[PDB]
Amino acid sequence: INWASGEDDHVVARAEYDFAAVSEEEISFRAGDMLNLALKEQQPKVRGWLLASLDGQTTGLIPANYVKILGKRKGRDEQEAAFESVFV
């Protein structure tokens, strides 16, 4: 999964809050953690969730409003905007 590793273009986000997964579909993270997100083109429609990776291999759902979207980064609506904007 090349967006997860950052081999492909991907979105980067910073967790605002701690989050413990309650199902296997979800991934845990801590406030301040950096995650890679699928591009909007690869995002599933699950109200209140986004597809992300903490570890660069494992993917799952995180609550959209538990992270700050920082922008699109090249592979080696305030939120809709941030998904198309460039990461510094």
* PDB experimental method: X-ray
Cα within 13 Å of Cα(69), Cβ side: 26
SS3 38: coil
State the DSSP code for 24.
T
Resolution, angstroms, 1 dp: 2.3
Contact 71, 87 (CB under 8 A): yes
What is d(CA 48, CA 46) in angstroms, rounded to the nearest whole number? 6
Q: How many residues does the chain have?
A: 88
Strand duo 67-73 + 10-15: pairing: antiparallel
Distances (CA, A) of 16 to 33, 67, 85: 8, 5, 19
Give the chain's domains with CATH numbers. Answer: 2-70 (2.30.30.40)
